[PDB]
Symmetry: C2
Subunit: 148 residues, 2 copies
């Protein structure tokens, strides 16, 4: 009679896409191509939260990382790839419940650290991360060049 978290199945790709496009606006086929791979992967977790009326109101994606993640001292570590809750549902703390499901899952992979990141100019994401129990570790500038 409230909210409910579940790992995403192929049957729920549309509900996943609808929220995923709000988080990361992009071409539908790019999303779907990625979504279909992720659900076959053991090192990936993707969840949806539903209401009574079967409305998908939140999603989370996470991974297990074996390469060095900034701010960490162990490997592997869990990593938050994306989380999105509809505004009307933020005060419900379903985001806390989603995060907690990753930790149970990450514990299976012998992880003791759960990392994430956010754009430097997105302070709201910084406030959200702290509200979920994350603390800041490092601020980083990324560079790259083409290899000719």
């Amino acid at each position: 009679q409230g909210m409910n978290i579940m790992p995403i199945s192929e049957s729920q790709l549309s509900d996943w896409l609808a929220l995923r496009c709000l988080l990361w606006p992009d071409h539908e086929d790019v999303h779907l191509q990625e979504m279909r791979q992720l659900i076959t992967q053991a090192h990936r977790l993707q969840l949806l939260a539903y209401t009574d009326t079967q409305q998908a109101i939140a999603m989370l994606e996470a991974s297990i990382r074996y390469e060095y993640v900034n701010g960490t001292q162990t490997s592997p570590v869990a990593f938050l790839e994306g989380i999105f809750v509809l505004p009307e549902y933020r005060r419900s703390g379903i985001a806390t419940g989603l995060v907690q499901q990753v930790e149970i899952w990450a514990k299976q992979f012998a992880c003791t650290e759960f990392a994430s990141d956010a754009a430097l100019d997105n302070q709201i994401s910084h406030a959200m991360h702290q509200a979920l129990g994350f603390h800041e570790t490092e601020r980083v500038v990324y560079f790259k060049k083409n290899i000719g």
Copy 2:
């Protein structure tokens, strides 16, 4: 006539000495990390030597198969670290060290060469530009404990 060479198991001394300046830590920690690196196919570590066979620069790099911020390809080469003695920077040995990674990376089927730096290390940012890198993203990292 500076010479750039991959680091052998008998050059830990020169490597350690430059590696300690770049990342101050304790010797036995460095050393056992260094010994592991040498055997790894996805890793490259170089030293630059002068005429007098004085070690004046070092570089470490890796191939990354997991997502690196700012890139759109996988895998990518990644600059793990680079140090040139202050006195030898004006010689552009850092440039010659980067080039050796690219050749190595090309031959690993990479097309992008990524790196990062602490936000408060503007000198590194100036150095990355000097080496031909351009900025892709600025990012804050977070963490919480599980067990």
